[PDB]
Amino acid sequence: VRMNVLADALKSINNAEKRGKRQVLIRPCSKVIVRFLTVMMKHGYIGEFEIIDDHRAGKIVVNLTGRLNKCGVISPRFDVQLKDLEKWQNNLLPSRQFGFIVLTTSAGIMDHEEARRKHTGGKILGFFF
Amino acid sequence: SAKIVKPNGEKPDEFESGISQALLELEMNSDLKAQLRELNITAAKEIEVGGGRKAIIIFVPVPQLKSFQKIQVRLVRELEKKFSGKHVVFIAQRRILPKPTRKSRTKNKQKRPRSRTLTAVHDAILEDLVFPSEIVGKRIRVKLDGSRLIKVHLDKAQQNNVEHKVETFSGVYKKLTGKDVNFEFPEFQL
Amino acid sequence: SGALDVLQMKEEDVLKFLAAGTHLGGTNLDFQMEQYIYKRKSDGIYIINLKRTWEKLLLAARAIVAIENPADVSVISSRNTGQRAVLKFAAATGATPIAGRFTPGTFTNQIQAAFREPRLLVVTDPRADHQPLTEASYVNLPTIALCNTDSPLRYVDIAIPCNNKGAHSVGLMWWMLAREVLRMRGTISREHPWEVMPDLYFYRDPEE
Amino acid sequence: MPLAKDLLHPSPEEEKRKHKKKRLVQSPNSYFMDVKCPGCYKITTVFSHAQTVVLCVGCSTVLCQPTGGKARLTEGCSFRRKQH
Amino acid sequence: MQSNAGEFVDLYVPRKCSASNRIIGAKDHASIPMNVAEVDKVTGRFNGQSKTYAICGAIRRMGESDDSILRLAKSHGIVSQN
Amino acid sequence: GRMHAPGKGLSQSALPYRRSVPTWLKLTSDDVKEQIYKLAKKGLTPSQIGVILRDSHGVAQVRFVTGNKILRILKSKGLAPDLPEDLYHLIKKAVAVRKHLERNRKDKDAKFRLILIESRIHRLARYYKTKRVLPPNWKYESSTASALVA
RNA sequence: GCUGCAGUUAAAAAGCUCGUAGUUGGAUCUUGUGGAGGGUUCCCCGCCCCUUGCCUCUCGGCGCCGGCCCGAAGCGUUUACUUUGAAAAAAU
């Protein structure tokens, strides 16, 4: 089994970062995982990543720095309504000055600072800081 | 003739007509006829590259695609000289569909085949460009500005043959798909 | 390296390494000591490469040079073979030798009449001189040593592989170390042969 | 790990000695071989881990003895890749 | 750290080790800077400007440092091929 | 892991990346069809058929030389069996267990093992009947086991 | 003790397995360019095949010179979800 793909991915990157590894191996790839890691890269918590291709489900290899501290999954996937947002944002972030809870909306996957500017809630996926 | 031996798709163009004319002429000629058969194409097109060179594209009906791919090198050689200094490559004419939801109107008449979807076509397109080498690996890289560059590891069978065509494929692919590609060869193969 | 041949392997020294049996190495490996080995022999011996020895000798030595005052690069050895070697070492280049049993608490104490406070250490064989190594991480000393092929690496910033189960392998390696530091810091450099013998850096050994 | 790992590119053949599905891209390690034993001059093709007796239609008609691993040959002749 | 006032607050900015890109304490006594002396690389003689590195106590005490010092120095001198 | 044993193992086959290999193959699509039809006559079933093709001929898989598979090829004839070979092999097995139990009644170990294989029939059946590959009136019984095995 | 507890020895995992309900469940089916709003690519019209999917038309306006063009009419397989409106007694 592996009922949550996203949940198994992030624990690897958490464990790896602690030891100090700067290359990892994450499987299986999913499109959901790609856009996740895209957001995590833009802000600058991780570096460029390579998708190896198979004909099964792919595998991914990542280049990372010590900048990452902790990325989590939130299971099950709750709804957020842009007043429920603030209650969430307190609990998952160590500060008001940094960290980004991530979520998916009908306007696509993005961080919370961006979602508030689209004025649309949606389903929450994970978090990080 | 030369304007009615290629079905609909850019019927009056000078070069494209002159391609078809000498193409079918050769196929009927007895110089080779053991790898050449009189058939029609379905279109053609000429597109440049920034390398300071032109390249011709020849599309085919696609079930007839199997026969065109057979000779493909000898034939291309003759047309490299006939249209001097241009590379010539075959490709397959593949249809691509909007989503079954929420653009073009349908009654859900069909299922939207996965052999007529977008992604399946762009994979098949890559196979034609580097046809005499075949494809051993694919890898992809993602850049910090959200761009993506698609490395393609090709077999070292017929390495040299497509290694003097290696840049010209990239400018071709850009125009056909929209995507960015690079090529390489490894030293390790099954 | 990158210097023309004046910081690269010499034909002479290869003969000296092989005559002293430094290339041969013990019958065990670590997960950190497999990046200097090339491969194993027919025999249980595992063959250290000498190219890999030569580069590690240099940047190790360049760090020993980098201190402004050499009088506090404290060398240590407690096994018998590395006693005669270190004494000549610390005579040749300004250093402080600590021969025999270490007597622990040397740098940790404040009150002790044998108190020392160096900057670097150069230790023979980590698993005989474990006391000063542990104590190094209470006073922020960099550390250098001579590993066999199976000595534990932990509190060793840079290694200089060697056979070091005795013989001429010990004394030869300390001699070569002292040759390099003088070429770089001093004016002994001439790239033409040093007067001093590797002979009197070897073990005293029970005499005739 | 030494924390110097390279997973972008495989190791020369230390990647190709691991279990077959722990390789970066999966592959079988089995292969075919084109066999022509004495007295029946035809290019027979046989899988390395055949699992079964393979026949020839000439004077010879036995070529394998089933084994859990690679099948034993009845006469030690002919090995090809072939090709890919 | 900079306020909206432009006041550059915080008592000191702590050093960040090149070993694994993370920051050391102020009572971590296994964290060492190690100064390598450059040479001219034409004759083999001391020349001024040192290359200085810093390594954290955490990777040192588990014993990863031997590789880290090698990797740092391999992209420079006096190791360029090993 | 195994559905009624504790073990966790691997022995799963792994296919190559390239599927146009090994590029010398004798015979083409139409030829492969008649090669298959001959075998199904002789009492072989789709798993056996593909083995006897792969081992002694240039075929790796019929998937890689046609758009079909072994079962679909037989289905186009109407020469496909009336129920999956998978389902059959479970039912085929459980009768022999019931025979051993009638011949020896102190074998509690056998009695236990029958319950495992029994439940494994019902589970497999509950796949097929929703996919309409069996009658929805069909049910497994002692009686139906007797009739389907002989 | 949902947020937010605990079960080796402090209170505590059914002797063990099977099994219907319940709960939970792998991957897979789209990206670039001029104008407009904000940077130096990136997020209302369009373009490669698509772009609010279609037609078919006919009745009641808008046009241009009988003839022609485009808004409103059926809808995109269904839900949840999210966002906006409508709708809500007072006191507190």
Curated annotation (Swiss-Prot), chain B:
Chain positions of cross-link Glycyl lysine isopeptide (Lys-Gly) (interchain with G-Cter in SUMO2): K66, K70
GO MF terms, alphabetically ordered: structural constituent of ribosome
Posttranslational modification: Phosphorylated by NEK6.
Primary location: cytoplasm
Keyword Nucleus carried by entry: yes
Keyword 4Fe-4S: no
GO cellular component, one term: small-subunit processome
Compartments it resides in: Cytoplasm, Cytoskeleton, Microtubule organizing center, Centrosome; Cytoplasm; Nucleus, Nucleolus
GO biological process: ribosomal small subunit biogenesis; rRNA processing; translation
Pfam families according to UniProt: Ribosomal_S7e (PF01251)
Keywords: Acetylation, Cytoplasm, Cytoskeleton, Isopeptide bond, Nucleus, Ribonucleoprotein, Ribosomal protein, Ubl conjugation
Modified residue annotations for N6-acetyllysine: K70
Sequence similarity: Belongs to the eukaryotic ribosomal protein eS7 family.
Function: Component of the small ribosomal subunit. The ribosome is a large ribonucleoprotein complex responsible for the synthesis of proteins in the cell. Required for rRNA maturation. Part of the small subunit (SSU) processome, first precursor of the small eukaryotic ribosomal subunit.
Subunit structure: Component of the small ribosomal subunit. Part of the small subunit (SSU) processome, composed of more than 70 proteins and the RNA chaperone small nucleolar RNA (snoRNA) U3. Binds IPO9 with high affinity. Interacts with NEK6. Interacts with DESI2. Interacts with IPO5, IPO7 and KPNB1; these interactions may be involved in RPS7 nuclear import for the assembly of ribosomal subunits.
The name this protein goes by in its record: Small ribosomal subunit protein eS7
Native organism: Oryctolagus cuniculus (Rabbit)
Upper taxonomic lineage: Eukaryota, Metazoa, Chordata, Craniata, Vertebrata
This protein's encoding gene: RPS7
Curated annotation (Swiss-Prot), chain C:
Main location: membrane
Post-translational modification: Acylated. Acylation may be a prerequisite for conversion of the monomeric 37 kDa laminin receptor precursor (37LRP) to the mature dimeric 67 kDa laminin receptor (67LR), and may provide a mechanism for membrane association.
Subcellular location: Cell membrane; Cytoplasm; Nucleus
UniProt keywords, alphabetically: Acetylation, Cell membrane, Cytoplasm, Host cell receptor for virus entry, Host-virus interaction, Isopeptide bond, Membrane, Nucleus, Phosphoprotein, Receptor, Repeat, Ribonucleoprotein, Ribosomal protein, Ubl conjugation
Cross-link (Glycyl lysine isopeptide (Lys-Gly) (interchain with G-Cter in SUMO2)): K88
Subunit structure: Monomer (37LRP) and homodimer (67LR). Component of the small ribosomal subunit. Mature ribosomes consist of a small (40S) and a large (60S) subunit. The 40S subunit contains about 33 different proteins and 1 molecule of RNA (18S). The 60S subunit contains about 49 different proteins and 3 molecules of RNA (28S, 5.8S and 5S). Interacts with RPS21. Interacts with several laminins including at least LAMB1. Interacts with MDK. The mature dimeric form interacts with PPP1R16B (via its fourth ankyrin repeat). Interacts with PPP1CA only in the presence of PPP1R16B.
Family named by the database record: Belongs to the universal ribosomal protein uS2 family.
The keyword Oxidoreductase belongs to this UniProt entry's keyword annotation: no
GO molecular function, one term: laminin binding
Coiled coil: none
Modified residues (N6-acetyllysine): K51, K88
Span of the entire protein shown here: 2 to 209 of 295
Name of the molecule in the record: Small ribosomal subunit protein uS2
Modified-residue entries (Phosphoserine), positions: S42
GO cellular component, one term: nucleus
Curated annotation (Swiss-Prot), chain D:
Tagged with keyword Nucleus: yes
Pfam families found in the cross-reference section: Ribosomal_S27e (PF01667)
Predominant place of localization: cytoplasm
GO biological process: ribosomal small subunit biogenesis; rRNA processing; translation
Listed GO MF terms: structural constituent of ribosome; zinc ion binding
Gene3D superfamilies (UniProt xref): Zn-binding ribosomal proteins
Entry's localization field: Cytoplasm; Nucleus, Nucleolus
Positions that bind Zn(2+): C37, C40, C56, C59
Any one annotated GO CC term: cytosolic ribosome
Stretch list, region Disordered: 1-23
Biased composition (Basic and acidic residues): 1-16
UniProt keyword list: Cytoplasm, Metal-binding, Nucleus, Phosphoprotein, Ribonucleoprotein, Ribosomal protein, Zinc, Zinc-finger
Matching PROSITE patterns: RIBOSOMAL_S27E
Biological role stated in the UniProt entry: Component of the small ribosomal subunit. The ribosome is a large ribonucleoprotein complex responsible for the synthesis of proteins in the cell. Required for proper rRNA processing and maturation of 18S rRNAs. Part of the small subunit (SSU) processome, first precursor of the small eukaryotic ribosomal subunit.
Assembly and binders: Component of the small ribosomal subunit. Part of the small subunit (SSU) processome, composed of more than 70 proteins and the RNA chaperone small nucleolar RNA (snoRNA) U3.
HAMAP family listed in its UniProt record: Ribosomal_eS27
Name this protein carries in UniProt: Small ribosomal subunit protein eS27
Gene source species: Oryctolagus cuniculus
Phylogenetic classification of the source organism: Eukaryota, Metazoa, Chordata, Craniata, Vertebrata
Swiss-Prot record, chain E:
Gene3D superfamilies: 3.30.1230.20
MF (Gene Ontology): structural constituent of ribosome
Keywords: Acetylation, Cytoplasm, Endoplasmic reticulum, Isopeptide bond, Ribonucleoprotein, Ribosomal protein, Ubl conjugation
Short name of one Pfam family: Ribosomal_S21e
PROSITE patterns: RIBOSOMAL_S21E (PS00996)
Cross-link (Glycyl lysine isopeptide (Lys-Gly) (interchain with G-Cter in SUMO2)): K41
GO BP annotation list: translation
Entry GO CC: cytosolic ribosome; ribonucleoprotein complex; rough endoplasmic reticulum
Localization (cell): Cytoplasm, Cytosol; Cytoplasm; Rough endoplasmic reticulum
Residues modified to N-acetylmethionine: M1
Keyword Ribosomal protein assigned: yes
Highest taxon of source: Eukaryota
InterPro entries recorded: Ribosomal_eS21, Ribosomal_eS21_CS, Ribosomal_eS21_sf
Main location class: cytoplasm
Entry keyword annotation includes Transmembrane helix: no
Subunit structure: Component of the 40S small ribosomal subunit.
Protein family (similarity comment): Belongs to the eukaryotic ribosomal protein eS21 family.
Function: Component of the small ribosomal subunit. The ribosome is a large ribonucleoprotein complex responsible for the synthesis of proteins in the cell.
Entry protein name: Small ribosomal subunit protein eS21
Encoding gene (name): RPS21
